[PDB]
Amino acid sequence: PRVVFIDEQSGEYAVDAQDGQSLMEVATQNGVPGIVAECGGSSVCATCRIEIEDAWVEIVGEANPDENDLLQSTGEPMTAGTRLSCQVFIDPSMDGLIVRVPLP
């Protein structure tokens, strides 16, 4: 599936993901700046945090409870589309997904 990453300082990365890859894996494997897997997908580091662009927020689904716990406690206020990219796994429904990378 096609996944787009908004670097709102520089433009949109378009990557071709495979099914079952986590969003964080598709970013770190395609050199998308701003996503780092410090804790390796354990919902501790919150460094992989991404923002689902509005149209896709219902598709992707709200954050899991562990995500919601972490994202409401570590740093920036979360919104409807805020997710840990390590918790979002690519699948056919997500072809064309647009996500924004919280950046500098």
Is 92 labelled as part of a ligand binding site?
no
The C-alpha torsion from 53 through 63 and 42 to 97, rounded to 10°, is -30
Instruction: Identify which of residues 59 and 103 has a Cβ nearer to a second copy in the complex.
Output: 59
37 binds, among a second copy, ligand FES, none (CB under 5 to 8 A by kind): ligand FES
Residue type, 42: S
65 binds, among ligand FES, a second copy, none (CB under 5 to 8 A by kind): a second copy
User: Contact positions toward ligand FES, by CB under 6 A?
Assistant: 24, 37-48, 84, 86
**What are 10-19's contacts with CB under 8 Å, separation 24+?**
12/98, 17/90, 17/94, 18/90, 19/90, 19/91, 19/92
62 forms part of the interface with a second copy (CB under 8 A): yes
